Amino acid sequence: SGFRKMAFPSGKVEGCMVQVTCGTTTLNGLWLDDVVYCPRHVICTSEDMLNPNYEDLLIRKSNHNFLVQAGNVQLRVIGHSMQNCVLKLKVDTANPKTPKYKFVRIQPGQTFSVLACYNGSPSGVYQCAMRPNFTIKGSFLNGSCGSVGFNIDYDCVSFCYMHHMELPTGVHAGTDLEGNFYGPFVDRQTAQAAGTDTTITVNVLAWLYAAVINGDRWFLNRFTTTLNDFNLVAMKYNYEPLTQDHVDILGPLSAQTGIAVLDMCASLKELLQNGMNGRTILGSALLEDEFTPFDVVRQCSGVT
Amino acid sequence: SGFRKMAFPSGKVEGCMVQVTCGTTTLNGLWLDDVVYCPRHVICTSEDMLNPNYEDLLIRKSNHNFLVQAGNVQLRVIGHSMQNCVLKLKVDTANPKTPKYKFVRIQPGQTFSVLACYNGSPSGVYQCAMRPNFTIKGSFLNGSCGSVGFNIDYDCVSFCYMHHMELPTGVHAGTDLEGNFYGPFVDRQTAQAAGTDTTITVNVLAWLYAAVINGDRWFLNRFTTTLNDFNLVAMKYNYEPLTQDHVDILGPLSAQTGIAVLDMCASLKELLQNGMNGRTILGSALLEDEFTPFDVVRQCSGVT
């Protein structure tokens, strides 16, 4: 029992983290086979970041202009390609620790683990969700760019995020490993700002189910609601709409707890309308939306 | 910016996790050099756990009665010793992935990362604190016993916890790697119950400093307090006493923020007396006490 925001074990990603230096700019890179993927703005200074012409900075960059360090070992950059906002640095050595991996583009509301790295060295791992506004609420200091987000399925590391930018609001924006930013964000400073975020309703419901599974049941009311009526309430509290797909995804948790999703929705509706009156759920005084139904299932089962 | 409950990268611990089976009981073991450390109750059935005579179950256990699997590879148990509540299984192969490591006994209030494992396979990593009552609020399902807690300092893994028991209250108890339980807990079911827990004040203050560093400053009041007066308030809210040692430990955060510890204490006092009035701090509607001053410093700096 117990329910924690759990990240994936990071070892298989730790073994892929390298440091990429281009001039004075040092960020992290992901070394998979003989390619290191890193944010293209490694070629930028902080001053370049206002409105950088990347293929201009890059076209005046050579392969030798990219310095990749893995641990205490330098990899020669023997090719450089820009794919969207990621630099693919072909290196002279394939990473022996390249796990089985996939590059995936996650959907808003999905969660992944971030291995925060500085200078190619892993500092910490934490779980987070792709917000509906395509930001992530991470913990990224200067030099964490290129830190990646991932999910692990058995033996396969699905890299879904590479950290590129802290927006002026202090949330974080990045790309998939094909260098396509999540959301309307760009690797330049600009009036670029995060759009309004919303609460991931299906995750809140999953976490309420997690709460029930862990015995924190006080918020369970005696009512049910329709999906439409719940969504009217959801909307008022800046919660994403709950779709029938979400309802179906929550099916296993409903089955485990016996609580029909629409009944849980009624409970959530009441939590939204009435608040938590100083109570907590799973040690939180807020409704948590960074656990997907699958996270809840995994954590409540022994998924390794 | 951003501040997350971050765990240590788990790779160096993942490489030490093995499965230890004794009969039908399978739990996790820590494989360091040629020893696998695991909870002695691997020799227990669930029925044995009410009041197990361990050196009785063990004395009728042979070296061959212990089955250790590392990945898909069996290690022969060529010796077995019980040290307090841990079984040290001498195995025929030293773990090639044994990191530099130390066994440390942490103090209540200190935090560590847990790599939750089932059947020797890492499932997730999360950070937690040794509560003042020597429990941990983890996420442990059956079969997670032997999962370890650790901190990483540079290259050294300090193992400080091995998971042994879920208490009937749903919190978790365990030992250091010498098998000495944290707290008055025993590896037997009994009226054994967690003593009253308290909030780790110095960690709350550290997290308030983290909040200030991250720009969440609304709770900063204009007052100061004495340590004694703060402690009177702390006491009323089941907060641990703040010692001058704590104050001194918070010095670096005070220096960084300019907020004298006793001024922060005044702010915390007001938070305790008045609540948060629906506001959050670092996205939490409760005061968080699972970040030590060192965690805050590490996370707010780039410590890898």
Ligand SMILES: O=C(O)C[C@H]1C(=O)O[C@H]2[C@@H]3OC(=O)c4cc(O)c(O)c(O)c4-c4c(cc(O)c(O)c4O)C(=O)OC[C@H]2O[C@@H](OC(=O)c2cc(O)c(O)c(O)c2)[C@@H]3OC(=O)c2cc(O)c(O)c3c2[C@H]1[C@@H](O)C(=O)O3
């Ligand atoms: O086992 C451990 O405990 C860790 C240990 C490890 O995992 O080894 C795997 C792993 O690759 C896969 O898992 C894999 C990749 C695929 O592409 C693929 O198709 C697969 O089927 C598999 C795979 C395998 C076995 C399974 O049972 C399974 O389920 C799988 O999926 C498998 O045989 O993989 C090879 C092996 O070697 C490495 O891969 C290559 O060498 C390689 C990669 C390429 O992309 C490529 O093009 C190429 O030519 C070579 C990878 O190494 C690490 O990833 C690693 C990372 C760290 O961070 C460490 O610390 C670390 C390691 C390895 C070792 O170095 C160590 O001691 O530690």
Ligand SMILES: O=C(O)C[C@H]1C(=O)O[C@H]2[C@@H]3OC(=O)c4cc(O)c(O)c(O)c4-c4c(cc(O)c(O)c4O)C(=O)OC[C@H]2O[C@@H](OC(=O)c2cc(O)c(O)c(O)c2)[C@@H]3OC(=O)c2cc(O)c(O)c3c2[C@H]1[C@@H](O)C(=O)O3
């Ligand atoms: O480097 C990587 O990226 C991972 C890679 C790795 O770290 O190797 C280290 C590591 O041990 C230390 O770090 C270490 C231990 C000490 O006791 C000690 O005194 C030390 O000074 C050091 C050390 C070292 C270097 C530093 O720069 C540094 O700062 C250090 O502190 C160093 O040379 O260590 C040896 C090396 O080999 C292994 O240790 C032994 O073989 C050993 C252990 C014993 O206890 C023992 O009695 C014995 O006779 C042998 C350990 O291996 C892993 O721990 C490991 C774990 C995983 O989970 C992986 O996935 C994984 C690995 C290794 C590899 O297998 C892989 O590819 O991946």
